[PDB]
Amino acid sequence: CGVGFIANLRGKPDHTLVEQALKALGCMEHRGGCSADNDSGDGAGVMTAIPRELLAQWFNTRNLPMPDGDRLGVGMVFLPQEPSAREVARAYVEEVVRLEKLTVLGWREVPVNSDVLGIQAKNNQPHIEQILVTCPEGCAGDELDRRLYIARSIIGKKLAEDFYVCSFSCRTIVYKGMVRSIILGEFYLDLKNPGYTSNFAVYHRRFSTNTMPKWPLAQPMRLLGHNGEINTLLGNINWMAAREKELEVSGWTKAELEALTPIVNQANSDSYNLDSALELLVRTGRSPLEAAMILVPEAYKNQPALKDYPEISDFHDYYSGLQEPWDGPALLVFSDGKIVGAGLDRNGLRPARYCITKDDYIVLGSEAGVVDLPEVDIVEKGRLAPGQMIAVDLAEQKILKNYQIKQQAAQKYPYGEWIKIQRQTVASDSFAEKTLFNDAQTVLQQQAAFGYTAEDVEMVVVPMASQGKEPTFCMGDDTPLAVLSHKPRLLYDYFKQRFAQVTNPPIDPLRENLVMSLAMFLGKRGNLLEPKAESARTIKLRSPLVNEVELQAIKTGQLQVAEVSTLYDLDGVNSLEDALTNLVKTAIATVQAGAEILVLTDRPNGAILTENQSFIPPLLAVGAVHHHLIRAGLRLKASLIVDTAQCWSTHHFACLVGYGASAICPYLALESVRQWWLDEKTQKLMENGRLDRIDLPTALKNYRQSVEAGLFKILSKMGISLLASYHGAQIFEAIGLGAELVEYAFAGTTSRVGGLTIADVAGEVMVFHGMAFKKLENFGFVNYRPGGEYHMNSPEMSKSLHKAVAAYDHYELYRQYLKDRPVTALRDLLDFNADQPAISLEEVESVESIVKRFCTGGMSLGALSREAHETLAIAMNRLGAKSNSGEGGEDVVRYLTLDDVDSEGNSPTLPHLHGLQNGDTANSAIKQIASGRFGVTPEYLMSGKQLEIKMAQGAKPGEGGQLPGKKVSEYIAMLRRSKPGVTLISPPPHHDIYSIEDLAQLIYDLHQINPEAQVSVKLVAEIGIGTIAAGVAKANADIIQISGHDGGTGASPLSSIKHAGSPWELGVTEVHRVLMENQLRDRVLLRADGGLKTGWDVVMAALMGAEEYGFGSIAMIAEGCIMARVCHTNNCPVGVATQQERLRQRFKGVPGQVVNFFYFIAEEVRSLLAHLGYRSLDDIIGRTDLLKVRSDVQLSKTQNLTLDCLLNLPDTKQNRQWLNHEPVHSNGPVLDDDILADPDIQEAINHQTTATKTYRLVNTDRTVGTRLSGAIAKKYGNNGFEGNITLNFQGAAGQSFGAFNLDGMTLHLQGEANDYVGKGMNGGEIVIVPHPQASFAPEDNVIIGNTCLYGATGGNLYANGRAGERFAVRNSVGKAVIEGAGDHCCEYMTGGVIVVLGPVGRNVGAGMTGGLAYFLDEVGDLPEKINPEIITLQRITASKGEEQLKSLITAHVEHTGSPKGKAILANWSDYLGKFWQAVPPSEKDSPEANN
């Protein structure tokens, strides 16, 4: 979406501002989407003041007196088209208006031109009228809008696509519709009426994830226009709804508040709910600014900018206890008709740029280019940094800046005094060291009974306590889903973590930890509407993990505490179900008796579980009491603490909090740590072979630190900062839980496959009871064991495949390893139901044809040896299929076809490979673009047939790629332009992609540089992918990859491998269905991966809607992988997943073997087609009617699954045209096409001549220069061009100006630019300066946006002005001089040189591992703004450093004329001492940092 506002402070209200708003909307068209007719819009709208001059004509025609402005209520209403229905609706509106004691003056038919609408919107269009209203008692202004708000809320009980009030106010009105931006004013005649005047406008252009427009869903809403995505919505809704029955404020009756009723509803969009909640806050006595501060609070902790504003910190300190953030990316633009303003989310994940004139005229929007004001009278160009706001007081004619706004709200009450007196904090650095139990026999028995398994303590708890981090592992989750397993599992294992992809970004829990918090508040939640001292009475925790000391301190504390047992007797009468019934009833009664904290314990009275008792699993207990308290209207009366033996992993703590726990005492987990440390084997080891750097207090501290780190990780996967927001929210998908159970304890969680009843979960806990009543059982779970859990991959299976394939049987032995499998994946429950007789094999399409659909897929050159990586590429190219350069870039030597193969199959070009032939090429057909951008060079991008944007992989979907430092050889460091020994943890998000429109921008950038390459987007299966994928299709992607939770990895957290991501069957099927239903299916080819091994797997994936098939782990096995599962270790025995030269030499593996593998699978596909009676894969894709449930399958834990999710797909027997795709989608006409068509430019490219051209630019001119870069790179590579092209531009540049710039290209821009300037720049020069007529001091003003130089591998940028956040984010070799920046300057920088001649925001140098930066700090507060994890700050001492800085500023002055640079150079000696130099420990001994 695009959004913004314009305000005329000092001039008379006019039509010009309205025209400007419509033009601004037009400049934001690329930020919105269109319906299936490619004509109707997802939404465009404007909010303005009431057009009094226009409405006067209506009063005149009627000979009616017109009331004063603050006395005339106007309702803009969408009504039914059908006349009889329209009159029932009208009568209802009038009826409620009368009930508010208001008078209906009449109705105005709104003049429209329906013939400009797209066909779907035209079909959809409501009948649009305005109701005119007054108060005969004389109410006006605030009170009138209050009564209209009440009226709106009552009328809104009958919401329909057909019956909706857009606005009802005496100050504001909204004109909106399902239109493209330039259509809005052609549809509403009022908007082009010169009599329409307004002192402000809020405009919005919508991007939706569907193709079926509904008019009420355009924006603005009543108060707010919203760009972003709420990532905690289910939680935010649940908490707010729980407030509804108890609402109380001065100035309001109980009955009026009751009329507002459902403030929030999960049926409605995030935007609708936010508008509603925010208006409730406004209309009960806050400004919209204060409302937004409470609902979407700043990350106020560790904010140096708040040093002189203690009251602002106090405000948030207070509200932190009352209201969790409605988190996720957001630019909010809103108006009262009194104030108009804007604010960002805590992380500033949407852009907001603004402009102020000499007359205090102000323009703010998603992009800077957007209103043409005389450049000469602009007095400031600014932006909103994270959490910031800006506003206008219309009556006062005043612009209000960030901290002025917040201080005024904060000073209303003595928030801090209240906290001082009322709040209790519980925290303890010490643990209890005395053991709970004395017999290790007791400890072991309790462990067994509560579900601890040998690997649980050995592979999970012990590493957490001994290392202080959760464990890393490798390869995929090879095992049956918990519901399909014959092994006992925990209720936790049925819940998969949800995560962010495309529609909102993950955040970085390490680099941007400063923005996150695990703090929690215990006790009753106060009145949100009426601030009082009482509401600060709480117990604050710094962490949800409460140790024995902290638990006792809580039990004492100032709040009423009650213990509630989760145990019950096994008396042959009690069941888990009535124990649950009793639990819930007890909890309610206990809360009714005044308990403010409930401790749900499986150790009541401090007594141990016996053989005569069982327990309610803590996740079941907490979920049940959480939801039943909600149902009882008691949820805000108390907090829940889980005191449980069944909690030890990172995933456990997250599930517990996600479903209602404020805090957890994991008493058996702590006891497990104690007993491990106090084990003579451990004590004896420490005397030599384990780190005895660990006394008991350190082991315990390490354990807790591991859990806390793991919680930050899980939150960040979804982009969530505060545990308080995660607490209500239910950021999971359940797999294998029945509807009845889900409704009882996990209401609102999707669980698409049915499954477990309450009785089934009890049966499962009883398996562990029977094991408990010498050592814990080791099940198969992490690594294959002879009698353990089944793994799809194992060494023996692997060895028979490799020998079958090297032979030219071994394959039949391999084939039966697979068929003897227990049920493992969802597809295992299905079988074929043919609708046609079998045909003969000779009729079926050839193996050569089928193999074209196969992809090997992106395994990085760091994770794999070049031997294993290149071998795959040669094999896929021989096949006419595709391989993928995962996220480590690619060696340029591979771009060329092999010429020099001898008769033994060896090539001097790639001498480490074997079994080659002269036609061969190791070029990866698919080139990957991942968040780290390591590969990412113009030549690299031109070498791809296809380009893949990797949003997530199945093994670790919330997170970035991971390459252990030991595997970063000099070779890898060269490819990646990073530092040899250094661990690469890639950013979780693309800093390029914080929304669907930002993804559309990256796809545009890729189509720009390489218009012939298809662009794919790699997603991971989870509920919500369908919606996401519809967006991706609207964003002009050519392909969508769906990856299963299943897939391999060279290194990932073990928790992520086991707990995050869903089956591909669910993903492929959901995406296929959603695309077909939106009529978007023809727009994209669908590819699938995750545990694909076999022709049968391929046929199953085909039936579910996949057209292409990816293979990772299995392809590695074909090359000799023996499933050692030490990939993350660098010790691969077989030279596949290692960089060690001497292990690489062991690599046997020839392209011919993997060729043979794929022919085997394709032959299997042919036998299956013949059986089904079809000639071709093309005939069966999406034919889910050929699937049936297998009758020979009986599940261990439950009766059956529900598989409608897989079977109920749209009919595809007859309608198959969606299989026909356009070769590659176009960007449409682009300025670079005109540049490239110019004969002088063609001459400069082809003859390497000098050329210069000059052009006017506007914000809709995106990615300029980039198509020319691609053309040069295609011909000359990155460094071959000897020509010289200078392009001069004037105006406001759109997104991605100078992306992928190369040597020989000079881009000059006079004006300003939007985000991503020089994205992936490789060479040349970009120079950005203000207009000559600009009067402001350039160094004090924004000229460039966010994420500039992202992943740059070379080049120089000179900008005479300030940048936004993440300047030089992941810079590898770019150089730049700028005059100031927002937050996170140089964030993942590994090289190059950055000079900032002005103030910078906080979090400087987070993850900066190489390169140098120089910061001019004339204030003296820079040391407070550094991220101290890696870089050191020092004054310039080395003469080489001084000369490097001086040369760059001298260049900056020559290019720019920078007045600031000139002043520095004129007084060099005075300014030198005010610079700080940022030095990572790779640069400590460089001459420019040392000596």
Ligand X SMILES: Cc1cc2nc3c(=O)[nH]c(=O)nc-3n(C[C@H](O)[C@H](O)[C@H](O)COP(=O)(O)O)c2cc1C
Ligand Y SMILES: O=C(O)CCC(=O)C(=O)O
- Residues 6+ positions from 1433 with CB-CB distance below 8 Å: 1422, 1423, 1426, 1476, 1477, 1478, 1479
Q: Which of 860, 885, 1041, 1055 binds ligand Y (CB under 6 A)?
A: 860
Residue 288 contacts ligand Y per CB under 6 A: no
Question: In which element (H, E) is residue 765 found?
Answer: helix 758-772
Q: Six-digit token pair at 888?
A: 């480590």
655 is in an annotated binding site: no
Residue 872 contacts ligand Y per CB under 6 A: no
1121 is in an annotated binding site: yes
Query: Least distance in Å: CB of 652 to ligand Y?
Result: 24
Exposure string of 912-949, with b = 16+ CB inside 10 Å and e = fewer, is: bbbbbeeebbbbbbbbbbbbbbbbbbbbbbbbbebbbb
Q: Do the beta carbons of residue 1173 and residue 1182 sit within 8 Å?
A: no
Q: Six-digit token pair at 1288?
A: 């001069």
Residue 1277 contacts ligand Y per CB under 6 A: no
Q: Which of 225, 862, 1067, 1182 binds ligand Y (CB under 6 A)?
A: 862
Q: Six-digit token pair at 678?
A: 């106090």
Q: Which is nearer to ligand X, 278 or 1057 (CB)?
A: 1057
The residue with tokens 């409302």 is: 291
> What is the C-alpha to C-alpha distance for residues 859 and 1144, in angstroms, rounded to an integer?
16
Q: Do the beta carbons of residue 720 and residue 347 sit within 8 Å?
A: no
Q: Which is nearer to ligand F3S, 627 or 1058 (CB)?
A: 1058
Residue 887 contacts ligand X per CB under 6 A: yes
Q: Is 573 exposed, middle or buried (0-12, 13-18, 19+ CB in 10 A)?
A: exposed
- Tell me which residues in 357-386 interact with ligand X (CB under 6 A): none
Select from ligand F3S, ligand X, ligand Y, none the partner in contact with residue 984, using the beta carbon and a kind-dependent cut-off of 5 to 8 Å.
Answer: ligand Y
Residue 1430 contacts ligand Y per CB under 6 A: no
Q: Which is nearer to ligand F3S, 128 or 1122 (CB)?
A: 1122
Residue 863 contacts ligand X per CB under 6 A: yes
Q: Which of 135, 599, 620, 1051 binds ligand Y (CB under 6 A)?
A: 1051
- Tell me which residues in 877-896 interact with ligand Y (CB under 6 A): 887-888
Select from ligand F3S, ligand Y, ligand X, none the partner in contact with residue 1124, using the beta carbon and a kind-dependent cut-off of 5 to 8 Å.
Answer: ligand F3S
Residue 962 contacts ligand Y per CB under 6 A: yes
At 556, is the secondary structure helix, strand, or coil? helix
Query: Least distance in Å: CB of 1137 to ligand F3S?
Result: 4
Cβ–Cβ contacts within 10 Å for residue 771, how many? 15
Is the peptide bond between 220 and the residue preceding it cis, with omega within 30 degrees of 0?
Answer: yes
SS3 per residue for 20-40: HHHHHHHHCHHHCCECCCCCC
Residue nearest to ligand X (CB): 1112
> Does 1 qualify as catalytic in the annotation?
yes
- Residues 6+ positions from 384 with CB-CB distance below 8 Å: 331, 342, 343, 344, 348, 352, 354, 390, 402
User: What's at 812, amino acid-wise?
Assistant: E
Residue 844 contacts ligand X per CB under 6 A: no
**How many H-runs (helices) and E-runs (strands) does the chain carry?**
49, 51
Q: Which of 476, 960, 1318, 1411 binds ligand X (CB under 6 A)?
A: 476
> What is the C-alpha to C-alpha distance for residues 293 and 387, in angstroms, rounded to an integer?
9
Select from ligand Y, ligand X, ligand F3S, none the partner in contact with residue 531, using the beta carbon and a kind-dependent cut-off of 5 to 8 Å.
Answer: none
- Which window, 240-248, 348-356, 837-845, 1104-1112, contacts ligand X (CB under 6 A)? 1104-1112
Query: Least distance in Å: CB of 973 to ligand F3S?
Result: 22
Helices 810-819 and 795-807 pack at an angle, to 10 degrees, of: 150
CA angle (852 as vertex; 847, 853 as ends), nearest 5 = 105
Size of the site for ligand X (CB under 6 A): 31
Q: Which of 672, 1113, 1296, 1372 binds ligand X (CB under 6 A)?
A: 1113
Query: Least distance in Å: CB of 964 to ligand Y?
Result: 9
Residue 1091 contacts ligand X per CB under 6 A: yes
Q: Which is nearer to ligand Y, 963 or 1436 (CB)?
A: 963
Residue 865 contacts ligand X per CB under 6 A: no
> What is the C-alpha to C-alpha distance for residues 1238 and 1041, in angstroms, rounded to an integer?
38
Q: Which of 958, 961, 988, 1095 binds ligand Y (CB under 6 A)?
A: 961
Pairing type for strands 1014-1020 and 639-643 reads: unpaired
Which parts of this chain interact with ligand F3S (CB under 6 A)? Answer: 475, 1116, 1121-1127, 1132-1134, 1136-1137
Q: Do the beta carbons of residue 671 and residue 630 sit within 8 Å?
A: no
Select from ligand Y, ligand F3S, ligand X, none the partner in contact with residue 963, using the beta carbon and a kind-dependent cut-off of 5 to 8 Å.
Answer: ligand Y
1385 is in an annotated binding site: no
Q: Which is nearer to ligand Y, 755 or 857 (CB)?
A: 857
- Which window, 131-139, 310-318, 1045-1053, 1271-1279, contacts ligand Y (CB under 6 A)? 1045-1053
> What is the C-alpha to C-alpha distance for residues 1438 and 1422, in angstroms, rounded to an integer?
20
Q: Which is nearer to ligand Y, 907 or 978 (CB)?
A: 978
Query: Least distance in Å: CB of 963 to ligand Y?
Result: 4
Residue 886 contacts ligand X per CB under 6 A: yes
HSE-up (13 A, CA, CB side) for residue 1134: 22
Q: Which is nearer to ligand X, 550 or 1046 (CB)?
A: 1046
- Which window, 501-509, 858-866, 873-881, 1188-1196, contacts ligand X (CB under 6 A)? 858-866
Q: Which of 963, 1017, 1124, 1422 binds ligand Y (CB under 6 A)?
A: 963
Residue 1488 contacts ligand Y per CB under 6 A: no
Range 304-313, long-range pairs (CB < 8 A, 24+ positions): 304/1402, 304/1421, 304/1424, 304/1425, 305/403, 305/1402, 309/403, 309/406, 309/407, 309/410, 310/416, 311/407, 311/410, 311/411, 311/415, 311/416, 312/403, 312/406, 312/407, 312/410
Q: Which is nearer to ligand X, 235 or 954 (CB)?
A: 954
Pairing type for strands 472-473 and 1052-1053 reads: antiparallel
- Which window, 688-696, 851-859, 870-878, 1409-1417, contacts ligand X (CB under 6 A)? 851-859
> What is the C-alpha to C-alpha distance for residues 199 and 210, in angstroms, rounded to an integer?
34
Q: Which of 1, 34, 135, 1205 is catalytic?
A: 1
Helices 758-772 and 576-592 pack at an angle, to 10 degrees, of: 100
- Which window, 743-751, 1044-1052, 1281-1289, 1390-1398, contacts ligand Y (CB under 6 A)? 1044-1052
Question: In which element (H, E) is residue 1098 found?
Answer: helix 1095-1103
Query: Least distance in Å: CB of 1090 to ligand Y?
Result: 13
Exposure string of 1344-1378, with b = 16+ CB inside 10 Å and e = fewer, is: bbbbbbbbbbbbbbbbbbbbbbbbbbbbbbbbbbb
Select from ligand Y, ligand F3S, ligand X, none the partner in contact with residue 1051, using the beta carbon and a kind-dependent cut-off of 5 to 8 Å.
Answer: ligand Y
Q: Which of 950, 991, 1034, 1183 binds ligand X (CB under 6 A)?
A: 950
CA angle (766 as vertex; 760, 768 as ends), nearest 5 = 120
Q: Which of 472, 646, 749, 1049 binds ligand Y (CB under 6 A)?
A: 1049
Phi, then psi, of 784 in degrees rounded to 5: -55, 135
Q: Is 199 exposed, middle or buried (0-12, 13-18, 19+ CB in 10 A)?
A: buried
- Tell me which residues in 1010-1069 interact with ligand X (CB under 6 A): 1018, 1043, 1046-1050
> What is the C-alpha to C-alpha distance for residues 575 and 1341, in angstroms, rounded to an integer?
69
Q: Which residues pair with 1187 in a beta bridge?
A: 832
Query: Least distance in Å: CB of 392 to ligand Y?
Result: 47
Interface residues with ligand Y (CB under 6 A) are 860, 862-863, 887-888, 953, 955, 961-963, 984, 986, 1049-1051
**What residue numbers does the annotated binding site for [3Fe-4S] cluster cover?**
1121, 1127, 1132
Q: Which residues are catalytic?
A: 1
Query: From the annotation, which residues make up the binding site?
Result: 1121, 1127, 1132
**Residues of the shown chain interacting with ligand X in the complex, contacts defined by CB under 6 A:** 476, 857-860, 863-864, 886-887, 950, 953-954, 961, 1018, 1043, 1046-1050, 1089-1092, 1110-1114, 1127, 1137
